[PDB]
CSV table of C-alpha atoms in Angstrom, one decimal:
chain,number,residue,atom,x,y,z
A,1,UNK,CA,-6.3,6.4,-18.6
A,2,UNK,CA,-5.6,3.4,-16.4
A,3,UNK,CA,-8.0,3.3,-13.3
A,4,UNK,CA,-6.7,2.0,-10.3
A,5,UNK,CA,-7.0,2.4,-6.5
A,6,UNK,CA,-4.1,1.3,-3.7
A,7,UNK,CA,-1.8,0.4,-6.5
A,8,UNK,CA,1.8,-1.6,-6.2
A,9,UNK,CA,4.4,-2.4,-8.9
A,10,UNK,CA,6.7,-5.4,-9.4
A,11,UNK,CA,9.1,-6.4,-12.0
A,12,UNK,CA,9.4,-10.0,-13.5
A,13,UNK,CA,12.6,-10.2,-15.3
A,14,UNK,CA,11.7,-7.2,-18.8
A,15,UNK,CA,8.1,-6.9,-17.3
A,16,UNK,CA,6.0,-4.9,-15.2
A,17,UNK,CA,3.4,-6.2,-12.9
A,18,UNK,CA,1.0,-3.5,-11.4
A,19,UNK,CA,-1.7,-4.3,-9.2
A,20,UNK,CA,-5.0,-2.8,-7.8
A,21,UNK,CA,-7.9,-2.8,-5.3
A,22,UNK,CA,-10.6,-4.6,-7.3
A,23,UNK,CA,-12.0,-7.9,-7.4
A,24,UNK,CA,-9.8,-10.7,-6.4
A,25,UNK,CA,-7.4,-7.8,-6.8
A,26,UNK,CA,-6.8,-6.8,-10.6
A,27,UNK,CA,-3.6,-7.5,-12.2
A,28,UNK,CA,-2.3,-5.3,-15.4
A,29,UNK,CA,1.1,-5.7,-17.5
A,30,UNK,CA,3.1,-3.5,-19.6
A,31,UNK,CA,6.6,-3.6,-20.9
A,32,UNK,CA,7.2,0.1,-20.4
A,33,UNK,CA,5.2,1.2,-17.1
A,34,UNK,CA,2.5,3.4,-19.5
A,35,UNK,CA,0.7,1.4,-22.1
A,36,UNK,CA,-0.8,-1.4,-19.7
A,37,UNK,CA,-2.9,-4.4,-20.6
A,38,UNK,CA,-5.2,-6.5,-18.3
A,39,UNK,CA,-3.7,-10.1,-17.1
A,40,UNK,CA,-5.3,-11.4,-14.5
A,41,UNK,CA,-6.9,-11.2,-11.0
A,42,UNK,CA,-4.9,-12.9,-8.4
A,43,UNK,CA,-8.3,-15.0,-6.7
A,44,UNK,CA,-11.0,-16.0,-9.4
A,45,UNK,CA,-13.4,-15.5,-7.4
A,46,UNK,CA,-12.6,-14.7,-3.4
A,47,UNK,CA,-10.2,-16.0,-0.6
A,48,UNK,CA,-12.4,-19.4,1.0
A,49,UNK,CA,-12.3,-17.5,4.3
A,50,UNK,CA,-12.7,-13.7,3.4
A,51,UNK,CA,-16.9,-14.2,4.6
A,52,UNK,CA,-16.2,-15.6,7.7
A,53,UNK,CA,-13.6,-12.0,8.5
A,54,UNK,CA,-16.4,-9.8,6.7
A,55,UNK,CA,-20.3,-11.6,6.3
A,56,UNK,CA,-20.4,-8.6,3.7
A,57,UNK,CA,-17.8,-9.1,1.8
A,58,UNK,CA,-18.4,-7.8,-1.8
A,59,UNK,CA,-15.7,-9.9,-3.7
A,60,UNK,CA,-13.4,-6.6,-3.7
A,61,UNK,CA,-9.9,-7.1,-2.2
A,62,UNK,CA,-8.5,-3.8,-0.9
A,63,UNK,CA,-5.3,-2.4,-0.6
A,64,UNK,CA,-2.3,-4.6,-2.3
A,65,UNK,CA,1.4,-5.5,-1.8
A,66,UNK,CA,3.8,-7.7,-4.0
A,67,UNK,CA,6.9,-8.4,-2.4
A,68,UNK,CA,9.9,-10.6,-3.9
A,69,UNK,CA,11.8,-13.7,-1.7
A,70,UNK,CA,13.7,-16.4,-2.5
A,71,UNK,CA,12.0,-16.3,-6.4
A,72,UNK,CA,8.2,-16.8,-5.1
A,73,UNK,CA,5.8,-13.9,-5.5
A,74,UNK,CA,4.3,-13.0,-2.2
A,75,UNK,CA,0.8,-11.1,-2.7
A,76,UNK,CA,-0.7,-9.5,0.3
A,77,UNK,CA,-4.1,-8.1,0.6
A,78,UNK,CA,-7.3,-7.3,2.8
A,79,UNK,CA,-10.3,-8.7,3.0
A,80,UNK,CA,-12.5,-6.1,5.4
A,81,UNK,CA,-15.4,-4.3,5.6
A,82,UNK,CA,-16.6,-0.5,4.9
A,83,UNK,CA,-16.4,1.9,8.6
A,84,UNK,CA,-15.5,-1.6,10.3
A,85,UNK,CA,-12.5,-3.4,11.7
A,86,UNK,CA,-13.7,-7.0,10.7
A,87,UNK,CA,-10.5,-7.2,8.9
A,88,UNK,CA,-7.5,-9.6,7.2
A,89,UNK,CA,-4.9,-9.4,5.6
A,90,UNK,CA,-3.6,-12.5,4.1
A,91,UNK,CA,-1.5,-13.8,1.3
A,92,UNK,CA,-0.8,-15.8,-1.6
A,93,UNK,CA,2.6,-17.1,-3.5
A,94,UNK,CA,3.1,-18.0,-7.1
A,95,UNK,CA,6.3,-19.1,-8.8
A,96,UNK,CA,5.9,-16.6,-11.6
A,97,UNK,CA,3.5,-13.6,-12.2
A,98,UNK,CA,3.2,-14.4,-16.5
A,99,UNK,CA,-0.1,-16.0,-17.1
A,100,UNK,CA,0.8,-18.1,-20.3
A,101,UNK,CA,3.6,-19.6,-17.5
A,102,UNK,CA,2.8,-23.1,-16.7
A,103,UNK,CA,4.4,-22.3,-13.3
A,104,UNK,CA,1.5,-19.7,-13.0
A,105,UNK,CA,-1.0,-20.2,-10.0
A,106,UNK,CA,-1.7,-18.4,-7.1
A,107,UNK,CA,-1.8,-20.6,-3.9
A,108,UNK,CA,-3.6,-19.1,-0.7
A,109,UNK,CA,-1.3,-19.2,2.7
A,110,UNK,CA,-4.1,-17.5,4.6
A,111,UNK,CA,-4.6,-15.2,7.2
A,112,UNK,CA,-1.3,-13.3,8.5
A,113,UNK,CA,-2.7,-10.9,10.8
A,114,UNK,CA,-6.7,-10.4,11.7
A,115,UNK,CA,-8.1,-7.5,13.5
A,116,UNK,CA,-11.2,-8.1,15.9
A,117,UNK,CA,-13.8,-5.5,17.0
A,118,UNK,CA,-13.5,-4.5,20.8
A,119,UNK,CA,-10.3,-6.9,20.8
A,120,UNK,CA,-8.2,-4.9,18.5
A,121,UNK,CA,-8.0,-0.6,18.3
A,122,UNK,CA,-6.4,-1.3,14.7
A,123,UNK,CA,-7.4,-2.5,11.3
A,124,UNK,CA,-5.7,-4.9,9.9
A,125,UNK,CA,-6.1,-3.5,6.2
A,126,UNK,CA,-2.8,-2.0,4.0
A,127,UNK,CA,0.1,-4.3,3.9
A,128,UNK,CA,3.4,-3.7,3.2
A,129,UNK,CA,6.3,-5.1,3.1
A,130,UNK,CA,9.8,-4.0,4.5
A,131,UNK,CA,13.3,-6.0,4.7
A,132,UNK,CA,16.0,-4.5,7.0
A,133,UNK,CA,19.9,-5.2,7.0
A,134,UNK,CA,20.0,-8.0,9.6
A,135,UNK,CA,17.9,-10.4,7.6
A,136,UNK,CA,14.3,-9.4,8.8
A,137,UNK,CA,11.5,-8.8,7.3
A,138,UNK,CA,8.1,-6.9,8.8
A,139,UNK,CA,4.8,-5.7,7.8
A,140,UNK,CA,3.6,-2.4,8.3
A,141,UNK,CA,0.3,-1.9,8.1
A,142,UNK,CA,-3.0,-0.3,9.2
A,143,UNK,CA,-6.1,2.5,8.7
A,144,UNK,CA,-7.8,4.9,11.7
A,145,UNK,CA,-8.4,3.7,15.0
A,146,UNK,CA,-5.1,3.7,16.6
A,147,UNK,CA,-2.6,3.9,13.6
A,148,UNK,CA,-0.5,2.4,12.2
A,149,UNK,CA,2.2,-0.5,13.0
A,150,UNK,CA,4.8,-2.4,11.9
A,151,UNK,CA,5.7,-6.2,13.3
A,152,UNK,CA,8.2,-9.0,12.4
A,153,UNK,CA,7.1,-11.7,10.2
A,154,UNK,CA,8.1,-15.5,10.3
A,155,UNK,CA,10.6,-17.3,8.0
A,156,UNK,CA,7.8,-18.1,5.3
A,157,UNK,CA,6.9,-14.4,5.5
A,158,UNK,CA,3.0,-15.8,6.4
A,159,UNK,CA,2.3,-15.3,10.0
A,160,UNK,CA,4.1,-12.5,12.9
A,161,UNK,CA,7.0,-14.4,14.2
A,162,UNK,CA,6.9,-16.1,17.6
A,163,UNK,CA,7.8,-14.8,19.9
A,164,UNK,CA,5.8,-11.7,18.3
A,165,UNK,CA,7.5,-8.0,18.0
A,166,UNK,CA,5.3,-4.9,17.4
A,167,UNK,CA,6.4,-1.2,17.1
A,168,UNK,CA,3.4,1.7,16.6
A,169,UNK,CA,5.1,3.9,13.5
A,170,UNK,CA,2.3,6.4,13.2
A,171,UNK,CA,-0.6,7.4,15.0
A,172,UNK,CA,-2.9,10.5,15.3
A,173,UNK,CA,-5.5,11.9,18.6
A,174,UNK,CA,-7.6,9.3,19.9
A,175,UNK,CA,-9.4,8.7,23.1
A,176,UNK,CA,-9.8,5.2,24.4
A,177,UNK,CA,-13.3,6.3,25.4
A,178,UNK,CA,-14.8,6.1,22.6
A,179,UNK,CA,-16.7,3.2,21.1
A,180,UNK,CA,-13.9,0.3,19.7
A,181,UNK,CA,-16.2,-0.7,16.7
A,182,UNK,CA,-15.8,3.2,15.3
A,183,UNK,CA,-13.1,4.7,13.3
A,184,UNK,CA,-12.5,7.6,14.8
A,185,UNK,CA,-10.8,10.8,13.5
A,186,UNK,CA,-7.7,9.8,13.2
A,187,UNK,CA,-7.6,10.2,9.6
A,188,UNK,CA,-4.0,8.0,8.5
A,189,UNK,CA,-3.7,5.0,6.8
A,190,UNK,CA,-1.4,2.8,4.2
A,191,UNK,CA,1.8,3.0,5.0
A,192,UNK,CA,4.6,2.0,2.7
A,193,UNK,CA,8.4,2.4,3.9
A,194,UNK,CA,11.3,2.7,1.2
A,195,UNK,CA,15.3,2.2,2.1
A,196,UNK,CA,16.8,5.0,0.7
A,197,UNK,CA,20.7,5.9,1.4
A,198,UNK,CA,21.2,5.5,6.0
A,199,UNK,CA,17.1,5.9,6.3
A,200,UNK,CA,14.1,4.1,6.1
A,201,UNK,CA,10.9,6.4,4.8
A,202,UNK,CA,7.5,6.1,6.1
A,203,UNK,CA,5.0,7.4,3.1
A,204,UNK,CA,1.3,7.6,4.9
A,205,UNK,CA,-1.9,9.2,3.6
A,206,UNK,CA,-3.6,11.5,5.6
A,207,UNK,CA,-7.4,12.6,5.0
A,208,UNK,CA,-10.3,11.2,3.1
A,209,UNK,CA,-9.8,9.2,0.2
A,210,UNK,CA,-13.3,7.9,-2.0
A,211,UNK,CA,-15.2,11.2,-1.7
A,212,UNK,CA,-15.8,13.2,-4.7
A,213,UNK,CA,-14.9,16.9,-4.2
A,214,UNK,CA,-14.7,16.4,-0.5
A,215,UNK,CA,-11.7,14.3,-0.7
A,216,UNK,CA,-8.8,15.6,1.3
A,217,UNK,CA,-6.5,12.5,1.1
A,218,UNK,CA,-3.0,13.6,0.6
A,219,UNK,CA,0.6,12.0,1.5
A,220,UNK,CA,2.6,12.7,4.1
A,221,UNK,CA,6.4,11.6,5.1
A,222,UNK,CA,8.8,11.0,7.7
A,223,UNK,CA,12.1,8.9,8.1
A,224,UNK,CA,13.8,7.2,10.7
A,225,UNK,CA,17.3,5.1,11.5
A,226,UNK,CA,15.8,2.1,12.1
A,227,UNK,CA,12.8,0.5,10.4
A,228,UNK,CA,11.1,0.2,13.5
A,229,UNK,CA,10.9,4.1,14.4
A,230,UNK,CA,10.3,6.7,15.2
A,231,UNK,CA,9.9,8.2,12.0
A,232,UNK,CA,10.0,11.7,12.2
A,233,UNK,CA,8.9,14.5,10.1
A,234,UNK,CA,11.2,17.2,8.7
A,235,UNK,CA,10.4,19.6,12.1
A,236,UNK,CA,11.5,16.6,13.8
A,237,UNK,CA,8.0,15.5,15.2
A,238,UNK,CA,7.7,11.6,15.8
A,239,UNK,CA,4.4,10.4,13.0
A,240,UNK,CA,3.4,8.6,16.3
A,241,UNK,CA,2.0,12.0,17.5
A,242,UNK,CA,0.5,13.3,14.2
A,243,UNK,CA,3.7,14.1,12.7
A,244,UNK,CA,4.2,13.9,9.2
A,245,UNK,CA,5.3,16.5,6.0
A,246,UNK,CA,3.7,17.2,3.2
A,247,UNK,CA,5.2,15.1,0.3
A,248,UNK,CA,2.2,15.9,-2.7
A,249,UNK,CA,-1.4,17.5,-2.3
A,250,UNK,CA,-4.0,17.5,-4.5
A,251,UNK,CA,-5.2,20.8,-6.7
A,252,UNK,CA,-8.2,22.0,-9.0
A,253,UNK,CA,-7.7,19.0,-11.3
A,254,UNK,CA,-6.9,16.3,-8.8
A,255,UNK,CA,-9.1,16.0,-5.9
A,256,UNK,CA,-7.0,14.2,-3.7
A,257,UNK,CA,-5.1,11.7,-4.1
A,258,UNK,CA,-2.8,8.7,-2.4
A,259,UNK,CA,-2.4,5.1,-0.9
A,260,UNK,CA,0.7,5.7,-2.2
A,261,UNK,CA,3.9,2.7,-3.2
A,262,UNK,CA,7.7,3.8,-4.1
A,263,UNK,CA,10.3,1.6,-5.4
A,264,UNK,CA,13.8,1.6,-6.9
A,265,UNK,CA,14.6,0.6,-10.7
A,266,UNK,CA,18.0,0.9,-12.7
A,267,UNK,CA,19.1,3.4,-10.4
A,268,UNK,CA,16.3,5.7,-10.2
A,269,UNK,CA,13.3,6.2,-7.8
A,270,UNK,CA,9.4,6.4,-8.7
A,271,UNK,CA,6.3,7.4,-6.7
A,272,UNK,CA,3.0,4.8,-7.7
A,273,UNK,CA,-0.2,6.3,-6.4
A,274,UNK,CA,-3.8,7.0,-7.4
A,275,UNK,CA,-5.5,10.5,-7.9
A,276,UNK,CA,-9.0,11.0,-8.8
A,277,UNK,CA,-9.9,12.8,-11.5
A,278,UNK,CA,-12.2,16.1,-11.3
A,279,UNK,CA,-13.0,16.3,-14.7
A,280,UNK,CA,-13.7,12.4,-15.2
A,281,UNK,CA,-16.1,12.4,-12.3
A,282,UNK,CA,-13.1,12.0,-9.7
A,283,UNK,CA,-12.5,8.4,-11.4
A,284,UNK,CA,-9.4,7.4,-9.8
A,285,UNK,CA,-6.3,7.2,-12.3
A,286,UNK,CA,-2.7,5.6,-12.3
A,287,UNK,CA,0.0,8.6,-11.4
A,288,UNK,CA,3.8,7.8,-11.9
A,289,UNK,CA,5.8,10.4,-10.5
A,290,UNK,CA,9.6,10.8,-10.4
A,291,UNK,CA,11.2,10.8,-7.0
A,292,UNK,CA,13.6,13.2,-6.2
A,293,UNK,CA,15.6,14.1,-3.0
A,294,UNK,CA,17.4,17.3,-2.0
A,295,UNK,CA,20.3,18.2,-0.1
A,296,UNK,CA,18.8,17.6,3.0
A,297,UNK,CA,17.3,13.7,2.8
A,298,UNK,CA,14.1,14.5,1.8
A,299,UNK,CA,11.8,13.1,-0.6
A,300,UNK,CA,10.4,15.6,-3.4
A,301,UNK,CA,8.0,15.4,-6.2
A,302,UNK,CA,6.9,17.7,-8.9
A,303,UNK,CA,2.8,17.9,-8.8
A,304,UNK,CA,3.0,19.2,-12.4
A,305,UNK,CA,3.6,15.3,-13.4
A,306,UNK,CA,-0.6,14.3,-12.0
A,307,UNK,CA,-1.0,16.2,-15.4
A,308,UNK,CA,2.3,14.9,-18.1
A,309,UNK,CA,1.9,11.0,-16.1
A,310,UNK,CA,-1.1,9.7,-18.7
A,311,UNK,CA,-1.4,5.7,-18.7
A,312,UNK,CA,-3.2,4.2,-21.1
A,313,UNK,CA,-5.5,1.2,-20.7
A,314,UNK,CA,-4.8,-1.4,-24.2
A,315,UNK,CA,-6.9,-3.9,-24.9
C-alpha cells in the first residue's frame, strides 16, 4: 500500500495528483486514484528560507494543500518544528503539475503567514484552502495552542489581504497562563472546509496522531452558513468551544487515523486521509472513503472501507 501522511488530491485534466508530508513534500500520480506511481517532490531540496523559521529543519515539509486559480497550481505547505510554533506556511505555483511538461517548474512565492513564539498562541502549520460565493478566498489553518483560524488572502492568493480579516473556527480549553512556547492540551488541528449544498464543512482531527498504539487521532465535523463560522456540531455546539461530531474513529486494525482532505469529482464526494496500520507497524497508509450525507446534512462514512480502500504503490 501507498504510505502517506496529511495527504491532498488534485486533478489535471484525466489525471490525479496526490500529495504528502515528506521531503520537499512527495508528489504521486495515477490515472485511476488506486494504482499510484511516484512523480516528483515539489522542492528538490528545501524552501531557501525554511532554516531561518526552524534552525532544525529536517528537509520534511508537513501538512500539504493544492488549490486551483486562474490555471496556476498553488501548493501550500509548512515548514516548522516538532512541539514548537517556529512555524510557516508558504507556497509555490507551477503552470502544470505533469513532470515531462516543459511548462513544469515549481516557483517559490514565500512565506504567507508565520507564527512566532510568545508573539503568536497559534501555529501556523495545515493550510487549506477555501473560496466562497462573493469572490474570496481564505486560508484556514492551524494545530494546538489556541486553534484553529481562518483569514482572507490577497489577489495572488500569497499573503493575508490588507487590511487583514481573521475569524477563530475552532478551538479547545486553554489557559493564557501557561507558557506560550508549549502546545498545550488542546488537542485539534488540520482543518479542511468543503462547500456542500447551503453549508460550508469544517473537517478537524482531534487527538494524537504519530504514536503507535497510543494514537487517538480521529475526525470530527461541524458546519456552518458562512465560511467564516461558527461551525457547529450536530448538538449545535460552536467547534470554537470544543465542539465537534464524530465523522470516522479508528478500530483494532487502524490505530487512528486523520489530517483529513474531501473534494468533489463527476458528481460524487470522497474522503482522502491517512490511517496507520496496526499490523504493518502503524505505517501510515492512503484511505479513500466515499462520502455520503443523510437526510439531515450530515456527512457519513462507512469505516468498513479503512479495510476494501487498498492503494498500491507501482513502480
Amino acid at each position: 500500500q501507498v504510505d502517506v501522511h496529511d495527504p491532498v488530491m488534485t486533478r489535471e485534466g484525466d489525471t490525479w495528483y496526490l500529495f504528502s508530508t515528506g521531503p520537499g513534500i512527495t508528489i504521486y500520480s495515477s490515472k485511476d486514484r488506486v494504482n499510484w506511481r511516484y512523480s516528483d517532490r515539489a522542492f528538490a531540496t528545501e524552501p531557501t528560507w525554511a532554516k531561518r523559521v526552524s534552525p532544525s529543519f529536517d528537509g520534511h515539509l508537513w501538512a500539504p494543500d493544492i488549490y486551483q486559480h486562474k490555471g496556476l497550481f498553488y501548493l501550500y505547505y509548512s515548514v516548522s518544528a516538532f512541539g514548537k510554533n517556529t512555524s510557516a506556511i508558504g507556497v509555490t505555483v507551477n503552470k502544470t503539475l505533469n513532470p515531462a511538461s516543459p511548462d513544469y517548474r515549481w516557483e517559490d512565492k514565500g512565506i504567507v503567514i508565520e507564527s512566532v513564539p510568545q508573539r503568536d498562541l497559534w501555529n501556523a502549520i495545515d493550510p487549506a484552502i477555501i473560496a466562497d460565493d462573493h469572490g474570496q478566498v481564505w486560508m484556514s489553518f492551524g494545530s494546538f495552542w489556541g486553534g484553529l483560524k481562518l483569514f482572507k488572502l490577497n489577489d495572488d492568493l500569497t499573503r493575508p489581504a490588507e487590511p487583514q480579516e481573521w475569524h477563530s473556527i475552532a478551538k479547545l480549553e486553554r489557559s493564557v497562563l501557561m507558557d506560550d512556547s508549549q502546545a498545550g492540551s488542546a488537542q485539534i488541528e488540520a482543518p479542511f472546509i468543503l462547500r456542500k449544498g447551503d453549508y460550508y464543512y469544517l473537517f478537524a482531527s482531534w487527538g494524537l496522531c504519530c504514536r503507535k498504539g497510543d494514537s487517538t487521532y480521529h475526525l470530527v465535523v461541524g458546519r456552518s452558513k458562512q465560511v467564516t463560522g461558527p461551525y457547529l456540531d450536530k448538538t449545535g455546539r460552536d467547534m470554537n468551544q470544543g465542539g465537534g461530531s464524530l465523522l470516522i474513529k479508528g478500530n483494532k486494525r487502524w490505530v487512528g487515523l486523520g489530517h483529513n482532505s474531501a473534494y468533489t469529482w463527476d458528481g460524487k464526494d470522497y474522503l482522502v486521509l491517512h490511517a496507520y496500520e496496526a499490523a504493518d507497524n502503524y505505517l501510515q497508509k492512503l484511505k479513500i472513503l466515499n462520502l455520503h450525507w443523510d437526510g439531515e446534512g450530515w456527512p457519513q462514512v462507512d469505516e468498513k472501507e479503512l479495510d476494501s480502500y487498498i492503494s498500491q504503490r507501482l513502480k
